[PDB]
Design a protein around this nucleic acid. Sequence first.
RNA 1: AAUUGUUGAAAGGGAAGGGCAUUUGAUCAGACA
RNA 2: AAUACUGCCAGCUGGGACUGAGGACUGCGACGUAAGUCAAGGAUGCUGGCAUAAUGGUUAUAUGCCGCCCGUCUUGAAACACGGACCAAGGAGUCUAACGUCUAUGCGAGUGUUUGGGUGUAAAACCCAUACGCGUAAUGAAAGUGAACGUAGGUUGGGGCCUCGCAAGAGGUGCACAAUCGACCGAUCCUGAUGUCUUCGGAUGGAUUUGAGUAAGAGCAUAGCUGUUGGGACCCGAAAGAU
RNA 3: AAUAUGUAAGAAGUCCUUGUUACUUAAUUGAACGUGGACAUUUGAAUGAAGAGCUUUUAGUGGGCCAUUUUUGGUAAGCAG
RNA 4: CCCUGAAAAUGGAUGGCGCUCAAGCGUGUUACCUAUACUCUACCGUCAGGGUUGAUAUGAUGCCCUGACGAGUAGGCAGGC
Lengths: 156, 53, 222, 148, 51, 185
Amino acid sequence: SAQKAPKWYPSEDVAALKKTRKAARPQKLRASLVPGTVLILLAGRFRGKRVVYLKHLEDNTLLISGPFKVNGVPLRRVNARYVIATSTKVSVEGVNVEKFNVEYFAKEEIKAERVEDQKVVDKALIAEIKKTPLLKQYLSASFSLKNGDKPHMLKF
Amino acid sequence: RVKANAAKRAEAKAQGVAVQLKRQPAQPRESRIVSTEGNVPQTLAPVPYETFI
Amino acid sequence: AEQVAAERAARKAANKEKRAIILERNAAYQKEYETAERNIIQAKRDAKAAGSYYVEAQHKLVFVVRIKGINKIPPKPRKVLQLLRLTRINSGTFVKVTKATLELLKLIEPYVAYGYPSYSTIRQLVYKRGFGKINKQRVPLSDNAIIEANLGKYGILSIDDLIHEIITVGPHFKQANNFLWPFKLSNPSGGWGVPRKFKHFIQGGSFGNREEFINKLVKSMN
Amino acid sequence: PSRFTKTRKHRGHVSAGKGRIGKHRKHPGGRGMAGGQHHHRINMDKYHPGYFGKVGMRYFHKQQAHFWKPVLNLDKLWTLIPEDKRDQYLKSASKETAPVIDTLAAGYGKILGKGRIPNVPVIVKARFVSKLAEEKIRAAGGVVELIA
Amino acid sequence: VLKKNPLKNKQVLLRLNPYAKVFAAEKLGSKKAEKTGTKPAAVFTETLKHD
Amino acid sequence: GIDHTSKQHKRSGHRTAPKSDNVYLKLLVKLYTFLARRTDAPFNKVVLKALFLSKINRPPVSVSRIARALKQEGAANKTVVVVGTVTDDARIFEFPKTTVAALRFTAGARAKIVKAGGECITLDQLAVRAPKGQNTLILRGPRNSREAVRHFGMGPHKGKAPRILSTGRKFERARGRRRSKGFKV
RNA sequence: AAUUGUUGAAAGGGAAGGGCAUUUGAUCAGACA
RNA sequence: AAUACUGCCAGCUGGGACUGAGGACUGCGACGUAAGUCAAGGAUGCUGGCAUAAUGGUUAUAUGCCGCCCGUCUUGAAACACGGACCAAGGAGUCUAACGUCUAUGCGAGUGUUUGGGUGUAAAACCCAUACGCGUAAUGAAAGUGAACGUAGGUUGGGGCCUCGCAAGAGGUGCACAAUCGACCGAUCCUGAUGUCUUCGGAUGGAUUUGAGUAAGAGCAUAGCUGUUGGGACCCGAAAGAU
RNA sequence: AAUAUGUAAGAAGUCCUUGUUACUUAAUUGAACGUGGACAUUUGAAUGAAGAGCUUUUAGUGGGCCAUUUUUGGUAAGCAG
RNA sequence: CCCUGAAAAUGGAUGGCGCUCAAGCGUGUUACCUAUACUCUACCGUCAGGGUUGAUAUGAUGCCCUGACGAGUAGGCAGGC
Ligand SMILES: [Mg+2]
Ligand SMILES: [Mg+2]
Ligand SMILES: [Mg+2]
Ligand SMILES: [Mg+2]
Ligand SMILES: [Mg+2]
Ligand SMILES: [Mg+2]
Ligand SMILES: [Mg+2]
Ligand SMILES: [Mg+2]
Ligand SMILES: [Mg+2]
Ligand SMILES: [Mg+2]
Ligand SMILES: [Mg+2]
Ligand SMILES: [Mg+2]
Ligand SMILES: [Mg+2]
Ligand SMILES: [Mg+2]
Ligand SMILES: [Mg+2]
Ligand SMILES: [Mg+2]
Ligand SMILES: [Mg+2]
Ligand SMILES: [Mg+2]
Ligand SMILES: [Mg+2]
Ligand SMILES: [Mg+2]
Ligand SMILES: [Mg+2]
Ligand SMILES: [Mg+2]
Ligand SMILES: [Mg+2]
Ligand SMILES: [Mg+2]
Ligand SMILES: [Mg+2]
Ligand SMILES: [Mg+2]
Ligand SMILES: [Mg+2]
Ligand SMILES: [Mg+2]
Ligand SMILES: [Mg+2]
Ligand SMILES: [Mg+2]
Ligand SMILES: [Mg+2]
Ligand SMILES: [Mg+2]
Ligand SMILES: [Mg+2]
Ligand SMILES: [Mg+2]
Ligand SMILES: [Mg+2]
Ligand SMILES: [Mg+2]
Ligand SMILES: [Mg+2]
Ligand SMILES: [Mg+2]
Ligand SMILES: [Mg+2]
Ligand SMILES: [Mg+2]
Ligand SMILES: [Mg+2]
Ligand SMILES: [Mg+2]
Ligand SMILES: [Mg+2]
Ligand SMILES: [Mg+2]
Ligand SMILES: [Mg+2]
Ligand SMILES: [Mg+2]
Ligand SMILES: [Mg+2]
Ligand SMILES: [Mg+2]
Ligand SMILES: [Mg+2]
Ligand SMILES: [Mg+2]
Ligand SMILES: [Mg+2]
Ligand SMILES: [Mg+2]
Ligand SMILES: [Mg+2]
Ligand SMILES: [Mg+2]
Ligand SMILES: [Mg+2]
Ligand SMILES: [Mg+2]
Ligand SMILES: [Mg+2]
Ligand SMILES: [Mg+2]
Ligand SMILES: [Mg+2]
Ligand SMILES: [Mg+2]
Ligand SMILES: [Mg+2]
Ligand SMILES: [Mg+2]
Ligand SMILES: [Mg+2]
Ligand SMILES: [Mg+2]
Ligand SMILES: [Mg+2]
Ligand SMILES: [Mg+2]
Ligand SMILES: [Mg+2]
Ligand SMILES: [Mg+2]
Ligand SMILES: [Mg+2]
Ligand SMILES: [Mg+2]
Ligand SMILES: [Mg+2]
Ligand SMILES: [Mg+2]
Ligand SMILES: [Mg+2]
Ligand SMILES: [Mg+2]
Ligand SMILES: [Mg+2]
Ligand SMILES: [Mg+2]
Ligand SMILES: [Mg+2]
Ligand SMILES: [Mg+2]
Ligand SMILES: [Mg+2]
Ligand SMILES: [Mg+2]
Ligand SMILES: [Mg+2]
Ligand SMILES: [Mg+2]
Ligand SMILES: [Mg+2]
Ligand SMILES: [Mg+2]
Ligand SMILES: [Mg+2]
Ligand SMILES: [Mg+2]
Ligand SMILES: [Mg+2]
Ligand SMILES: [Mg+2]
Ligand SMILES: [Mg+2]
Ligand SMILES: [Mg+2]
Ligand SMILES: [Mg+2]
Ligand SMILES: [Mg+2]
Ligand SMILES: [Mg+2]
Ligand SMILES: [Mg+2]
Ligand SMILES: [Mg+2]
Ligand SMILES: [Mg+2]
Ligand SMILES: [Mg+2]
Ligand SMILES: [Mg+2]
Ligand SMILES: [Mg+2]
Ligand SMILES: [Mg+2]
Ligand SMILES: [Mg+2]
Ligand SMILES: [Mg+2]
Ligand SMILES: [Mg+2]
Ligand SMILES: [Mg+2]
Ligand SMILES: [Mg+2]
Ligand SMILES: [Mg+2]
Ligand SMILES: [Mg+2]
Ligand SMILES: [Mg+2]
Ligand SMILES: [Mg+2]
Ligand SMILES: [Mg+2]
Ligand SMILES: [Mg+2]
Ligand SMILES: [Mg+2]
Ligand SMILES: [Mg+2]
């Protein structure tokens, strides 16, 4: 032979895992995140967009809607840590939202179901957006740090 | 101290045990109330610089 | 073959019975402690109104932590540092206060900082960094039956039983103390508060007996 | 062999095990047994006291052999009898018939007396006995016989 | 295989010392003391404010 | 770093397995390392070690030394163990019964041990008979009958035998050995 | 091999070469499945 | 009344960083009326990106910081101390005689077949009688003498074993080893019985002397590392002398 | 004086009884070695003890230099002891 | 504290630039920076303490748990190439 071969070989048998003790306990949101709050979207496709916050979905994501009609942002998933939660709020107390869950957004163009749903929600908000002036404009504008803005100083 | 360590041993065994006859270092002092009657504290100070020579 | 739950029962019900003893114990020191402490507070108060002056017992127990490093140390104190198990920098042991050690303590001020531990910092030392000497093996405490197996001899069948026999310098403080493997502190968190350390405490440095303050130091090195 | 030889271990270290200071020079102490009385006198008193100078008589032309005289004690003696014939004689420890050991035939010159042989009679042909040697033989019924 | 600190880890805190449960439970660590009003002799007070 | 109080990385300094390379020897070790881990009986730890010992620390127990050991009071029925070879000794005329466990018995020795109506047991038959070593008498030979120890510790006034290669007068018997040639030891 | 010619790439404000680390250029293994 | 300061809580709580060793179960706990549950003897859950030079390795370059020529002898070298322009290939603790400690192996009061003979498939292996060598006696310059008062002694520690006790412990025996007191043999100095070819003989009991001794043998042979000595003696090196 | 340094802090201990001899006393007097007997770990301070003891054989080294303190010669020295 | 006393040879040194209610001197209070040290974890090697021949698979100088330690010339030894 060219090499003399071990006197011992490892068991190719393969153990299983010690039974871990790490419960998936549920995530509590930071108090600034309350339904009807306008978020600022820090990263992502709709980075810099202002957006109403509807529901806290079971994968911890957040349900937002532009409304679509205002700034072009759909009912959509967004992460909670990629968001500056403002202090301006609208009453989402006549918006549906129960309909919407994780599987609602399975990957599987635009489903006609979605185009309609977008309209049931967005109509409701816009009803109530219009209840305070200028708000509807605010929501169509983006957010950018201007010169001499210091986030650690600013109030959102 | 060995002739004495005999005594304390017998005189205590023939009494009802409990003896302790190992030497122990000087233990710190206990709690005490030093009284003030006929004994008000006398305030002292440092004193200036003299020469006397 | 029974044992399955039979002898599981025969112990689990006796492991119960021990914790019963421990609770009833630890609960007792608690009373002993606060009552022992309220005593002094009323003892001082009682003298003041009476006119007099309640002088406390001299401390009976000291905690020492080695400040100075390893090298360039003269033969004699270099010996005492060993007999106090302080063979490396920032480790630290308890010492029972008696003349035949008080001289030792003297002999090595330039290299240790030391003083008077509180129940709070004896507690937080044992709990967090207290190990046992069990055929050497520097063994973490972490369960009450580690103690019991080795200091159970002399009473002491719980971690707070340890603390009690330490903080009171009771009849078995030698073996209760030496059971504890020399402590192993970090550099102080805040820093040292002196600029140069190797002066006496009184002279704005870090060594020798700083007394009541040996705590804040320790609770920063822990 | 040369592969456990330490000098193989030493390959690559300047000095070869021999110090940088004190080197491996030719003959520091002198050669051989030099300075026996001088810079090497500590080693010869102790380790070798008695070394120097004379004692006793000379003995020109001393033929060892003149003084040939192997020594066997009573201590053994019985061993000069083959084991099978041996017990035959121990048991039945009598006059009339007692073994005749010719120790000079067996190659000894003196019988000494190291200690205890049983109460069995033996006839000892020897060239020379020690007092005790001969004494102990009798007290078991033996005799010595003097021979050349 | 990994030493857990009590002090921060309530579980291990009760694997040793089960009195931790009462002590938290009875607040203990914040015990109000028997208010008294004994006042010190002026001998004490004079010679405090003396010079 | 640490003020070290004891030389670090110390080797224990006791053999831990015979240095010999004898298969049979190493088997005996496996017998007794087992026996000694699982028997809480002294005799198994003593024997285990002694099997590691070098030839110098295994002096021969003679057959007469064995004979004598039995004459101890109440010892005459014990079975003697000699971890090492056992030698014959024509100097005893009698020899008793018993049963000798040993690493080796010489030709002469088992003869005399058997001839006396006796038994010669190898160390592993003794295991079977006496797992706790019940009723053994362990003998050691004499370690300082060795020639070499004569010359150990030589030096003035130690009376301790020159390392010398011929002897006689003319051979280190003058100056420094007698009052009348310089001095004496 | 020292040393040399050509060709190719690259760096070079009083030497060259090295350590830790990363940019960029070139080149490469493995690993998906 | 408040507050400050100092101290404590096994009072609550936010942000940030690094780690994730382990690999069925087994422990100590914790919460529950309970069933079960848990953060309690070491990371899992969910979601996405690429499946490639994306990550990673090698390399050149650049940039931050750091980096004196190595070897030697020396208290101290980068040294204004020596060798070294560069490459290849040679190039230095050997062998032998005789030894110390140690270890392995054989056999063991003995041990060593190998001068030799036998013999052979022929410098091998296989076999062997007589000696010899070392050991099993010492001590004296020598003439010489030559190791048991005694269970081969007494004492004190001794592992181990034996006997009692559930056990803790108590006795019993106690090898090796060590300490000590003796006894034994030779030297030396005393002592000088019974006898006697009247000077031969030296029993006996003794002595702050002495010995590389006896006191139930440990040795012989092969081998190996280290070490010793003589040899060209780790390698190169005089000025000289000689025929 | 300070600093430095000898010894001691028990089981190889302590107490009773009364054995040996040629030393020794006026003397069974004493000395020395003993048999029999009484008392255990608070059995005779503290702290430590990754144990303690023991033997054999062999390397290198045997140019030393510095610092604080004490200190000799020298005016001194990066001098010499 | 400052000034005078205060004189040497290439051009040059609070380390440099520079600094004057200091970036100077004495002293106090905090915060902050960073060693191969300290604390915690991981891995390597060393030393030690334990566990494990029970067959019917693979190493018994092996396997498994555990703790502590790691400077190095001359020099020793070891295990390897
Ligand atoms: Mg779970
Ligand atoms: Mg939460
Ligand atoms: Mg929160
Ligand atoms: Mg718009
Ligand atoms: Mg102490
Ligand atoms: Mg002390
Ligand atoms: Mg003091
Ligand atoms: Mg900090
Ligand atoms: Mg802070
Ligand atoms: Mg600080
Ligand atoms: Mg400073
Ligand atoms: Mg300093
Ligand atoms: Mg800390
Ligand atoms: Mg070879
Ligand atoms: Mg090799
Ligand atoms: Mg050789
Ligand atoms: Mg080497
Ligand atoms: Mg090498
Ligand atoms: Mg050497
Ligand atoms: Mg050289
Ligand atoms: Mg030198
Ligand atoms: Mg000399
Ligand atoms: Mg001569
Ligand atoms: Mg002559
Ligand atoms: Mg002559
Ligand atoms: Mg002779
Ligand atoms: Mg003999
Ligand atoms: Mg005689
Ligand atoms: Mg051995
Ligand atoms: Mg022996
Ligand atoms: Mg001999
Ligand atoms: Mg020798
Ligand atoms: Mg001689
Ligand atoms: Mg003299
Ligand atoms: Mg230039
Ligand atoms: Mg696959
Ligand atoms: Mg406060
Ligand atoms: Mg708190
Ligand atoms: Mg993991
Ligand atoms: Mg893992
Ligand atoms: Mg409950
Ligand atoms: Mg759980
Ligand atoms: Mg790729
Ligand atoms: Mg890449
Ligand atoms: Mg690829
Ligand atoms: Mg990538
Ligand atoms: Mg790609
Ligand atoms: Mg290139
Ligand atoms: Mg490079
Ligand atoms: Mg530099
Ligand atoms: Mg070089
Ligand atoms: Mg010089
Ligand atoms: Mg210098
Ligand atoms: Mg150099
Ligand atoms: Mg120079
Ligand atoms: Mg030169
Ligand atoms: Mg040159
Ligand atoms: Mg070459
Ligand atoms: Mg050469
Ligand atoms: Mg050797
Ligand atoms: Mg052998
Ligand atoms: Mg013989
Ligand atoms: Mg041949
Ligand atoms: Mg031929
Ligand atoms: Mg033949
Ligand atoms: Mg023949
Ligand atoms: Mg022969
Ligand atoms: Mg001899
Ligand atoms: Mg003799
Ligand atoms: Mg003579
Ligand atoms: Mg004569
Ligand atoms: Mg006699
Ligand atoms: Mg006699
Ligand atoms: Mg005696
Ligand atoms: Mg006994
Ligand atoms: Mg004599
Ligand atoms: Mg003589
Ligand atoms: Mg001799
Ligand atoms: Mg012998
Ligand atoms: Mg031998
Ligand atoms: Mg051989
Ligand atoms: Mg040589
Ligand atoms: Mg010439
Ligand atoms: Mg000449
Ligand atoms: Mg004084
Ligand atoms: Mg002293
Ligand atoms: Mg009498
Ligand atoms: Mg007695
Ligand atoms: Mg003590
Ligand atoms: Mg201790
Ligand atoms: Mg130990
Ligand atoms: Mg030496
Ligand atoms: Mg030497
Ligand atoms: Mg000299
Ligand atoms: Mg020397
Ligand atoms: Mg020299
Ligand atoms: Mg001075
Ligand atoms: Mg000088
Ligand atoms: Mg000023
Ligand atoms: Mg110049
Ligand atoms: Mg200046
Ligand atoms: Mg500066
Ligand atoms: Mg400045
Ligand atoms: Mg200042
Ligand atoms: Mg602060
Ligand atoms: Mg600040
Ligand atoms: Mg460092
Ligand atoms: Mg590090
Ligand atoms: Mg093992
Ligand atoms: Mg090293
Ligand atoms: Mg050297
Ligand atoms: Mg290796
Ligand atoms: Mg090789």
